[PDB]
């Protein structure tokens, strides 16, 4: 079990595209999460407030050497926080930039965790046929929106399309203008780069965030064959050049609240970000 | 005996490639390509082809399973070989600028024409233009695009069939006398001309389309599809008032004004020939 290959495994559906190495899956994934119970089982009861998830619809990330990383949204990052929220009484709607199926990193699916798998099963229909984010902006936002918060889970695929979208931009500008939560972790914060699009100054300038660290993406992830190549830019770097305070440089499961921007650093931070989100959302219903 | 069971796709939940049996029947290491007919015929470097390619690989089916598909690589690459050899360059667009999803299991590995065309286009297939950027900067009456090309594969059914960007692209071609060239499930893209309108501008147009009877029947029984399509292309186009000209798959092609179609992967080679001749003839008409 320390003889497992360090080489990335090819994805036969795609040209020159690679899953993470069998060794890296041993160090970074697990059949069970650190989850041990929800705090606020049924606290909210009016059935009005909802979470809006913007998820990833493109699985493949083009790298510097021309190879592609077969990724997706990380499923623990998506599904653990959502177990907390749904159990607290907050229903969930899923959107992608085009209405395409949601792409997960199914190689990180913790197959033995009941809470995550049943969460995945309650969400399957919405993941396979999401709403179109432009349809959401047009009809379901504005000042009387029933959406209390926007959730952007991570995984490497969040780096693509979501980081340079005017539809994501408009969605962030609503949540600031209506005092709504933006919840995000991992690479999820690349979504935030969309706020500064076609603009001299991002309206998130001076916000503080947890971000997956540069040094891991450029070093350790590349040497254990998790990524088969180098990213062409890095999320923590470009968030800084837009005037955000990247409050961490390590991967400790750290979480952070700054006004209504709640963030997590990595997959390790999933279970806690779920608690933070539930807590801060029940705190704003008064 | 090859199995008629769909083969799982590791990358996606409850998703399947076609069954080994269906592959042994519907795919081949070689195409019937037997040469282009107008090598070097167009020599100004002005006119080009705008290809609109599929960027989603998974089709959700009536039974909850997903078909792992993409654009058909023969329907794509063979017509582009003809056009490129004739002297027309090609630019690739998708609806978001995501990479092009091909049905890599249909890739004829032994065919020099198709592999060659693929390797030239690799760069552009992996980083396409975004169709709306194209709409904003590269259409109008002085566009260097002489045709739009939409290839089939079952993936054309997704997005492209309900897109405002594809709709404006088709309006542009009608209004500036450009070719629309499509085949197989690709004509599903033409349903976009009818978005938010009582009457599609493509009403009364006659087309070749992959037949309803094969998708509902044979494709299911040999495990090419792992379940039924929720809607059928010939059926929806007929409902928008296009005339669907074929009920079978035989490699039939049709020209109706500047809309050139073929019925299936069988038509690929004759459609490239047909596009090239039509475009060369249109260039000779303007002098």
Residue numbers in the entry:
A (entry chain B): 5 to 290
B (entry chain A): 7 to 293
Provide the authors' original text about this structure.
It specifically belongs to the Hsp-type subfamily because of the presence of cap domain and aspects of its dimeric interface. The results demonstrate that SAV0551 is a glyoxalase III that produces non-toxic D-lactate from toxic methylglyoxal independent of any cofactors.
The core domain consists of an α/β sandwich fold with nine α-helices and six β-strands. Additionally, four short α-helices (α1 (residues 26–32), α3 (residues 110–112), α10 (residues 218–222), and α11 (residues 224–227)) and two β-strands (β2 (residues 64–66) and β3 (residues 72–74)) form the cap domain. The core and cap domains are linked via a 22-residue long-linker (residues 33–53). The Cys190 Sγ interacts with the His191 Nδ1, while the Asp221 carboxylate hydrogen bonds with His191 Nε2. The crystal structure shows that SAV0551 is a compact homodimer. The loops (residues 1–25 and 67–71) and β-strands (β2 (residues 64–66) and β3 (residues 72–74)) from cap domain are responsible for dimer formation.
